[PDB]
């Protein structure tokens, strides 16, 4: 599922003014054309892959294609230091403050937290040498934070600075998500403006993270293919953008 | 700015000019009123800056302010400014105008060490502790904060003197707008005060860190550095002052049709606002980045033009000294609303209106003309589209006279009818003449 | 052959004081450090526009046509000229622009500004991408001046030229004017280039049909495969590009902190804003000077093309041109001119040989008994298989008479014939 | 446009180098002198570009004057509209400042009349013997010859006609015959 | 301008002296000392009077 | 002209962008680089005219 510039896949809309019916030459963070990304699959037959062992480099930023070209939302763990867990040699430990993006409920409520991950000394928990992996496992309002409940069984989350919640409505169509860090903090981009074809990333949140994020991992999930999201990196690239009548980017050129 | 003739004389830079139709600049358009429209937000909270423990330069504290209204007059009374070094702004400019973000980085630093934070410095403090961005309008101020304000200093105040890693000893420098990495901080927090390069191993890579303290250079009027970086992004303005500008009025319905100076959401300019019928955005732009309209807080759309926008031409003949005005490509029912922008005599003619002045032609609305049917072969006062202006036969000393409108008839050559038969017709000269 | 000649440049006047400074007194005070710039720009633009109108007036003075035949529905008889004839003499409205002029103007994207209520329109309609150059006149601070003559008057001049084509050039001098029909003028023009009256009388319907197909092939001639049509389109695009260069330069910061004087004034102290406004002022002055220099160069090009169009009209439209290659390829017969956007459109019909044959010809014929009596052909040759006369523009062997020969001095290259003497060589 | 822009400061503190030198320190006067240098350099470049385009226009006009001298003042033009309206008779050229001044004398009609003419006349007895005018018309009164630029009927002679091939448009005359057509 | 008004006037006067000739008959090699009135009458005759 | 006007400093400290970047601080780099940029734009505009 490669990046296509003629569909304007993964382009971030410029902040502020809404451009209309002109072409704009910008050099800013953009996905490189022809990039296949990295496919991540959540099973649905509990049953997880080793997505918590990687520690992929964050770089300038990442962009995610969620769903079609079951639509299960991703779970992310971003941090500055990556290393092994103690007394089991297992990788996946994030040191110091760590950003968590947890899709609670059925992907309708999101938890964003920025805090320490202290391993727990119980069986099948990190640091016990019985460790395998951590994962998120899937009416009245108590399961609105159930992703937090799954993530706090493995980690203590002891000193937490930022916490917010976001409501997203259930859908099945295509959706994009991007994370970019600059001097003002961590910027979360989404294509939930849902106007016309959309598929353009607009700013919707800002997390006050001033330590440099260097790594990101995909938290494994299991619902009891059925899930595919691709994570593409962003590069400082020259692009040529085409805005249409409505004010959305329709064509891109990778230059 | 008295007549259209005087505006014609002030442009082109001469008094004795020849006859013709000339384009004329404006000289009597001034901003009369003032308008200010900005959103209200809850106040910015500056308690962490002045009422808590002073941060250390090794791990300084940064706060980004968004969607709040500040008050610089209160902030400057709690500090005594020693020296401010601003890049593309001034503190007077910081007390006004809207931004999209407001980043403040602050830490405790002795006043004797201004040279270690100046631009172009090669010291260890810029290299390993704090590197300023200098890509946005920023101002770094040096101030002394009294202990009665609420500031305090405790613990050890230290800065990294060296931080290198790897087998090649690569320096872990600080990017502009960044801080020291967590490896350097962890190496420093166990490093001795005296400045010995100890060796550690964070995550499988050897790291070496040394530090020095400046906690004995701090006094009761605690020397503090505040670095204030603003960002400008039109259409995304969020931080504006609690103080509304002083002259300005907050209601636009009594300022419609007159050139006013507006401060709508942190951007300043002059123009004329008129109500017009024609929302994914608030401001409306054309292809060339010129705001041509805006949506107000109530239900109304005012499309804004520049202070001068109507093209004015003056028809003048050097003999008899008469003159007339041509308002190019505009209806006669719109001139009387824009009058205040013209010259004083033209403004005095349009107000207390006499409709004998305004005639509508195919090239615009003319003033000082009268309709005529006479046509002229020579056209020295061409208005375009086969219209020539017929000058009056009375000089200006006897009073102003009106021009003639509509001219340039066709030559209409002689017609010879064809017999369309075996014979034809020829047009032969009886008499002749010689022309040079 | 279709040829487009651009005889004009857009007339543009720029409000210099409003363009360089947006009404700010500080900018207007700092502009005095560059002298009386706005007066010089205004005088240069006024001189350019005045010279342009003088050139247009002189060019249409060369289309004087002092005598004409009034246009009728039946013009040319068998020859079809309803495409070229006025729409007023044809069905419907009293406008003089022919069907070909309407087809040429309707197939070129002009984006008419509107010289009557352009302001008001631009105000009522919102932002766009096709009329934003027109709406930038009242924002950037310039104006496109209307042409000197209305399209009705230009069409009247063209129609009067069309009615005078057949009669002009009949005999020596330009004083008289015959009212001969168009078909007779065409037949005489074809006879003058070497076609016998026998061939013209025998093949008149074929000639009329060929002319009708040649003129009717221009219904689909205004496409992208036509070179002169693309010349019209790219002249219009060049004018639009110059206008777009006048705008979109106030959006350039030119190294300053912003593209607008008000932000510079607000964001900086009284000493730094002087140098920032100086940067902006220097940028605007550079843009205006470049535009004025471009206008002068385009005025020179328009003057050259106006001189060329004056000769084209005086040499080919008003008379048959015997000079090679000046008006189309082949043998020139008759040329028509209509009004094009910012110029004139010429259509030269030509006589082209479709097929060629080769035949032995002689310089002249003498007599064996009287060697001092020799003849030479006029507008033709002496082709063999004895000797007969041909037209030198169409193959038709015809008996030798005194109407196609001349008595000339004897030469060595002349052929000698003893039997079957031509009637010129008899006695 | 050369002596006027020497008085411009171009954003500097003065329009001269002598007081820029003596009012500022050595580092601060380099930028002021460079501003003056930039302004005068742009002025000189603009002057040179204007000289080049004016020389191009002068070359075009010199070619036009060369063609016009060799055609109209040195010979009879016999070209429509190239050397004045009407028919060209004689032209003269005199010297003018930075160019030449031409005076084209032309023949202009003042009053016109319309008469009925013929393409040529043939004889009914001999249809193969037909004549045509050379520099005029066969105007009808029976038939007379006239000039193409002046109305003055004359008898038809052999010095103003020439024999032509017969056509259909030629008028038949059998009552009175002109001397070219008589036998 | 490279030439004094005397010289330029000499060229113009020499051109004026050869108006009547230099085109009397085909070819430019010969020159006929024709009076100006005769040249004007011949030109009007060639026009069609 | 195009070949030779690339060696001019145009009032900057050097005719190379790299030397200006290496020798000066980021506030003065944009000031001095704009002096080279303006001169090269002037050269290209003169060539096109
Ligand atoms: C970042 O994380 C590291 C590792 O979690 C912290 O280093 C620990 O510091 C405590 C306090 O002295 C020690 O008891 C541990 O032994 C250290 N761990 C390791 C692996 O060295 C470090 O303090 C954190 N940085 C902060 C909080 O700024
Ligand atoms: C969680 O936050 C608390 C509050 O700052 C930390 O407690 C501080 O720890 C440092 C280092 O041991 C002491 O110098 C401070 O006096 C403590 N403050 C208080 C109020 O107790 C605590 O260390 C943090 N926990 C982790 C794991 O970093
Ligand atoms: C500005 O910030 C300070 C500290 O960041 C706020 O002070 C806190 O206020 C809450 C409730 O008002 C208390 O529970 C905390 O103990 C206070 N902490 C400190 C350090 O003072 C203050 O309330 C903020 N101002 C506003 C208007 O919200
Ligand atoms: C911004 O801050 C200044 C200073 O704190 C405010 O000025 C004070 O206004 C109150 C109200 O009358 C007075 O009692 C104080 O004496 C004033 N202090 C000074 C130093 O002048 C000002 O009102 C604030 N602005 C807004 C909009 O609240
Ligand atoms: C046609 O006959 C003439 C004679 O009347 C030939 O011309 C002569 O050629 C001889 C060659 O020796 C010359 O000496 C004469 O002076 C020529 N006389 C004239 C009047 O030119 C001519 O060559 C013959 N044509 C051909 C084709 O042979
Ligand atoms: C003058 O007489 C000639 C000979 O009769 C006419 O030519 C004929 O005209 C008729 C009808 O006009 C045609 O049908 C014949 O074909 C013509 N013959 C030829 C040989 O062309 C001529 O038309 C007469 N002139 C006028 C004005 O009628
Ligand atoms: C350049 C090394 C050779 C010359 C050595 C001679 C004298 C050196 C003495 C001090 C060197 C300081 C140079 C920079 C001064 C400001 C340092 C800063 O705060 O950025
Ligand atoms: C040219 C004009 O206006 N009038 C002329 C007049 O000068 C001339 O004397 C007369 C001779 O017939 O013909 C008429
Ligand atoms: C007599 C004749 O052929 N007339 C036709 C006419 O009907 C047609 O409309 C026109 C279009 O080119 O061509 C011609
Ligand atoms: C994850 O599993 C794949 C599948 O075998 C394996 O190739 C890869 O090395 C694993 N990554 C680890 C253990 O970090
Ligand atoms: C984790 O452990 C493996 C082997 O146990 C080692 O190769 C790797 O370097 C370790 N990772 C870190 C970050 O120390
Ligand atoms: C993890 O690696 C370290 C380093 O060699 C080792 O001392 C420790 O025993 C390992 N843990 C396990 C459970 O093997
Ligand atoms: C999200 O939805 C819940 C339930 O309706 C609500 O309580 C909460 O305020 C919402 N959050 C936001 C940010 O709107
Ligand atoms: C700090 O506040 C105290 C309390 O009034 C005052 O005495 C002292 O002068 C203040 N410090 C300064 C520097 O003004
Ligand atoms: C502005 O003034 C008009 C004048 O009639 C009034 O109707 C309107 O309510 C005012 N708007 C305000 C005060 O917000
Ligand atoms: C808006 O449109 C209506 C027609 O429905 C018209 O009467 C009115 O004048 C228009 N308003 C403006 C400001 O042009
Ligand atoms: C001008 O002509 C119009 C055409 O009908 C006529 O109505 C009008 O009265 C005329 N004006 C004068 C002053 O004769
Ligand atoms: C946008 O540009 C296209 C390009 O052809 C044009 O057709 C359309 O009318 C434009 N729309 C607007 C609102 O300007």
Angle at C61 between CA C57 and CA C66, to 5 degrees: 150
Q: Two tokens at D28?
A: 């601060």
CB-based contact C79:C186 (threshold 8 Å): yes
Task: Find the farthest-apart pair of alpha carbons in chain C and give their distance in angstroms, rounded.
Answer: 114
CB-based contact B226:B55 (threshold 8 Å): no
* Beta carbon of A84 within 6 Å of any ligand 12 atom: no
| Exposure on the CB side of residue B52, measured as CA atoms within 13 A | 10
- Which residues of C make CB contacts under 8 Å with F? 255, 290, 293-294, 297
Residue nearest to atom 14 of ligand 12 (CA): A88
User: Distance (Å, rounded) from C-alpha B431 to C-alpha B384?
Assistant: 38
Task: Determine the length of chain D.
Answer: 183
CA of C41 to the centre of ligand 17 (A): 41
CA of B145 to the centre of ligand 14 (A): 10
For chain D, give the DSSP string: --SSTTS--TTSS-S-HHHHHTTS-TTHHHHHHHHHHHHHHHHHHHHHHHHHHHHHHHHHHHHHHHHHIIIIISS---STTBTBSSEEEEEEEEEETTEEEEEEEEEEEEEEEEEEEES-EEESS-TT-EEEESSEEEEE--EEEEESSS---B---TTSEEEE---SSSEEE-SS--TTT--
CB-based contact A196:A172 (threshold 8 Å): no
User: Distance (Å, rounded) from C-alpha B109 to C-alpha B111?
Assistant: 7
* Beta carbon of B275 within 6 Å of any ligand 16 atom: yes
* Beta carbon of A50 within 6 Å of any ligand 10 atom: yes
Phi then psi dihedrals of residue C308, to 5 deg: -65, -40
C66–B309 C-beta distance less than 8 A? no
Of D104, D151, D169, the CB nearest to B428: D151
Nearest residue in F to B86, CA atom: F27
Q: Nearest ligand, CA of residue B114?
A: 7
Using the Cα atoms of residue C294, residue C299, residue C300 and residue C305 in order, give the sign of their dihedral: positive
Candidate from B41, B47, B52, B65 with most ligand 3 atoms within 8 A of CB, to mutate: B47
D149–C197 C-beta distance less than 8 A? no
Q: Which helix (H) or strand (E) holds B124?
A: helix B124-128
Candidate from B277, B293, B334 with most ligand 16 atoms within 8 A of CB, to mutate: B277
User: Distance (Å, rounded) from C-alpha C399 to C-alpha C311?
Assistant: 41
User: Distance (Å, rounded) from C-alpha A166 to C-alpha A113?
Assistant: 12
Q: Which helix (H) or strand (E) holds F48?
A: helix F26-48
Candidate from A55, A82, A84 with most ligand 11 atoms within 8 A of CB, to mutate: A84
Q: Nearest ligand, CA of residue D128?
A: 6
Q: Tell me how the structure was determined.
A: cryo-EM
Question: Mutate which of A162, A210, A248 to disrupt the B interface (most B C-beta within 10 Å)?
Answer: A210
D92–E19 C-beta distance less than 8 A? yes
Scored b (16 or more CB within 10 A) or e, F31-44 reads ebbbbbebbeebbe
Using DSSP, state whether F39 is helix, strand or coil.
helix
User: Distance (Å, rounded) from C-alpha B356 to C-alpha B433?
Assistant: 48
Chains that touch E (3 or more CB pairs under 8 A): C, D
Q: Nearest ligand, CA of residue B221?
A: 14
Task: Determine the length of chain F.
Answer: 49
D112 touching B, CB under 8 A? yes
B435 touching D, CB under 8 A? yes
Residue nearest to atom 6 of ligand 13 (CA): A167
Pocket of ligand 11 (CB under 6 A): A 83-84, 89, 91; B 203-204
- Which residues of E make CB contacts under 8 Å with D? 1, 5, 8-9, 12, 15-16, 18-19, 22-23, 39-40, 43-44, 46-49
Helix, strand, coil shares of chain B, percent, nearest 5, are 15, 35, 50
Using DSSP, state whether B12 is helix, strand or coil.
helix
User: Distance (Å, rounded) from C-alpha B12 to C-alpha B35?
Assistant: 35
C172–E47 C-beta distance less than 8 A? yes
Q: Two tokens at A172?
A: 């099945």
CB pairs under 8 A between B and C: 230
Q: Two tokens at B133?
A: 């961005």
- Closest CA relative to residue A220, chosen from A137, A156, A144: A137
User: Distance (Å, rounded) from C-alpha C317 to C-alpha C67?
Assistant: 15
Pocket of ligand 13 (CB under 6 A): A 165, 167
E15–D93 C-beta distance less than 8 A? yes
Using the 8-state DSSP alphabet, how is residue A197 labeled? T
CB-based contact B396:B321 (threshold 8 Å): yes
Determine F/C contact with 3+ CB pairs under 8 A as the test.
Answer: yes
Beta bridge partners of A25: A240
Determine F/E contact with 3+ CB pairs under 8 A as the test.
Answer: no
CA of B80 to the centre of ligand 14 (A): 11
Pocket of ligand 7 (CB under 6 A): B 115-116, 121-123
Q: Two tokens at C36?
A: 């009386």
User: Distance (Å, rounded) from C-alpha D132 to C-alpha C278?
Assistant: 81
What is the rounded (10 degree) CA torsion for D33, D35, D40, D42? Answer: 150
- Closest CA relative to residue C123, chosen from D44, B234, B286: B286
All residues of chain D having their beta carbon less than 8 Å from the beta carbon of residue C176 are 137, 148-149
CA of C193 to the centre of ligand 9 (A): 28
């Amino acid at each position: 599922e490669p990046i296509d510039m003629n569909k304007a896949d993964g382009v971030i809309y410029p902040n502020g003014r809404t451009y209309s019916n002109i072409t704009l030459q910008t050099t800013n963070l953009f996905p490189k054309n022809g990039d296949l990304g990295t496919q991540y699959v959540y099973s649905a037959s509990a049953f997880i892959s080793n997505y918590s062992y990687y520690g992929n480099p964050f770089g300038d930023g990442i962009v995610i294609r969620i769903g079609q070209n079951k639509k299960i939302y991703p779970a992310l763990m971003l941090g500055s230091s990556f290393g092994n867990f103690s007394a089991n040699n297992k990788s996946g430990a994030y040191f110091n403050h760590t950003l968590l993006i947890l899709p609670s409920k059925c992907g309708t409520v999101f938890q964003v937290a920025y805090c320490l991950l202290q391993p727990r000394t119980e069986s099948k928990c990190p640091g016990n040498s019985n460790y395998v992996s951590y994962f998120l496992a899937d009416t009245s309002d108590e399961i609105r934070r159930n992703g937090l409940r799954d993530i706090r069984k493995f980690f203590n989350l002891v000193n937490c600075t930022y916490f917010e919640e976001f409501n997203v409505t259930a859908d099945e169509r295509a959706e994009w998500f991007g994370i970019v860090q600059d001097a003002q903090g961590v910027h979360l981009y989404t294509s939930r403006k849902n106007g016309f074809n959309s598929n353009n990333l607009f700013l919707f949140a800002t997390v006050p993270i001033y330590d440099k994020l260097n790594y990101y991992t995909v938290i494994p999930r299991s619902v009891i293919a059925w899930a595919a999201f691709y994570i593409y990196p962003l590069h400082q690239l020259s692009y040529l953008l085409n805005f249409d009548v409505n004010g959305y980017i329709t064509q891109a050129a990778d230059c | 700015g008295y007549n259209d003739y005087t505006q014609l004389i002030c442009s082109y830079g001469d008094f004795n000019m020849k006859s013709g139709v000339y384009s004329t600049s404006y000289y009597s358009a001034k901003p009369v009123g003032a308008y200010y429209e900005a959103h209200v937000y809850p106040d910015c909270n500056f308690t962490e800056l002045f009422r808590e423990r002073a941060p250390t330069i090794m791990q300084y504290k940064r706060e980004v302010f968004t969607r709040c209204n500040y008050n610089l007059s209160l902030l400057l009374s709690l500090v005594q400014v020693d020296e401010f070094v601003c890049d593309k702004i001034t503190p007077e400019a910081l007390a006004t105008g809207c931004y999209s973000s407001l980043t403040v980085d602050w830490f405790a630093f002795p006043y004797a060490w201004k040279s270690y934070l100046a631009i172009g410095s090669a010291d260890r403090i810029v290299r390993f502790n704090y590197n300023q961005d200098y890509s946005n309008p920023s101002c770094r101020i040096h101030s002394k904060v009294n202990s009665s304000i609420g500031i305090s200093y405790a613990g050890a105040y230290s800065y990294i003197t060296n931080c290198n890693y790897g087998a090649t000893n690569k320096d872990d420098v600080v990017k502009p707008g960044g801080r020291a990495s967590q490896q350097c901080i962890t190496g420093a927090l166990n490093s001795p005060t005296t400045g010995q390069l100890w060796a550690y191993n964070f995550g499988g890579v050897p790291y070496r860190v040394s530090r020095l303290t400046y906690t004995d250079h701090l006094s009761d009027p605690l020397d503090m550095v505040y670095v204030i970086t603003v960002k400008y992004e039109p259409g995304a303005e969020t931080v504006c002052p609690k103080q509304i500008r002083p002259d300005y009025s907050t209601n636009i319905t009594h300022l419609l049709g007159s050139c006013i100076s507006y401060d709508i959401y942190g951007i300043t300019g002059t123009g004329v606002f008129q109500l017009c019928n024609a929302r994914q955005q608030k401001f409306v732009y054309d292809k060339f980045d010129n705001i041509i309209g805006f949506h107000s807080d109530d239900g109304n759309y005012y499309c804004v033009a520049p202070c001068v926008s109507v093209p004015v031409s003056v028809i003048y003949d050097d003999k008899t000294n008469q003159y007339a005005t041509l308002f190019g490509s505009v209806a006669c029912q719109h001139i009387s609303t824009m009058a205040a922008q013209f010259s004083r005599e033209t403004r005095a003619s349009l107000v207390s209106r006499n409709m004998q002045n305004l005639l509508q032609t195919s090239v615009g609305c003319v003033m000082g003309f009268h309709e005529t049917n006479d046509t002229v072969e020579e056209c020295h006062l061409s208005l375009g589209q086969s219209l020539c202006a017929i000058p009056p036969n009375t000089n200006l000393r006897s009073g102003r006279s009106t021009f003639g409108l509509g001219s340039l008839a066709y030559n209409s050559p002689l017609r010879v009818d064809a017999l369309n038969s075996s014979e034809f017709k020829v047009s032969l000269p009886l008499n002749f003449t010689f022309g040079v | 052959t279709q040829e487009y000649i651009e005889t004009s440049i857009q007339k543009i006047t720029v409000d210099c004081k409003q363009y360089v400074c947006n009404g700010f007194a500080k900018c207007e005070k700092l502009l005095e450090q560059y002298g009386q710039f706005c007066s010089k720009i205004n005088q240069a633009l006024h001189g350019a526009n005045l010279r342009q109108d003088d050139s247009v007036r002189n060019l249409f003075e060369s289309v004087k046509t002092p005598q004409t035949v009034p246009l009728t529905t039946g013009f040319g008889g068998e020859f079809n000229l309803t495409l070229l004839e006025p729409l007023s003499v044809s069905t419907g409205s009293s406008n003089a622009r022919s069907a070909l002029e309407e087809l040429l103007f309707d197939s070129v994207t002009i984006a008419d500004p509107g010289y009557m209520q352009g302001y008001d329109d631009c105000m009522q309609q919102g932002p766009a991408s096709a009329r934003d150059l027109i709406c930038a006149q009242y924002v950037a601070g310039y104006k496109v001046l209307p042409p000197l003559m209305d399209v009705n008057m230009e069409a009247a001049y063209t129609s009067s030229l069309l009615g005078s084509i057949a009669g002009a050039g009949w005999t020596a001098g330009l004083s008289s004017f015959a009212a001969i029909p168009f078909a007779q003028s065409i037949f005489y023009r074809l006879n003058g280039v070497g076609i016998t009256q026998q061939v013209l009388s025998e093949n008149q319907k074929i000639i009329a049909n060929k002319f009708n197909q040649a003129l009717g092939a221009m219904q689909t001639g205004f496409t992208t495969t036509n070179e002169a049509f693309q010349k019209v389109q790219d002249a219009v695009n060049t004018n639009a590009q110059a206008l777009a260069k006048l705008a979109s330069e106030l959006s350039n910061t030119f190294g300053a902190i912003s593209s607008s004087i008000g932000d510079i004034i607000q964001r900086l102290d009284v000493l730094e804003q002087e140098v920032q406004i100086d940067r902006l002022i220097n940028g605007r002055l550079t843009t205006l000077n470049a535009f004025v220099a471009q206008q002068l160069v385009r005025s020179e090009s328009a003057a050259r093309s106006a001189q060329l169009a004056k000769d084209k009209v005086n040499e080919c439209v008003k008379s048959q041109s015997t000079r090679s290659g000046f008006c189309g390829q082949g043998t020139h017969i008759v040329s028509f001119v209509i009004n094009a956007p910012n110029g004139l459109y010429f259509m030269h019909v030509g006589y082209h040989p479709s097929q060629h044959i080769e035949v032995v010809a002689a310089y002249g014929l003498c007599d064996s008994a009287n060697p001092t009596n020799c003849i030479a052909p006029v507008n033709g040759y002496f082709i063999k298989n004895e000797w007969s006369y041909t037209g030198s523009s169409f193959y038709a062997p015809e008996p030798i008479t005194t109407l196609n020969t001349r008595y000339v001095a004897p030469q060595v290259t002349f052929q000698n014939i003893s039997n079957n003497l031509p009637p010129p060589l008899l006695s």
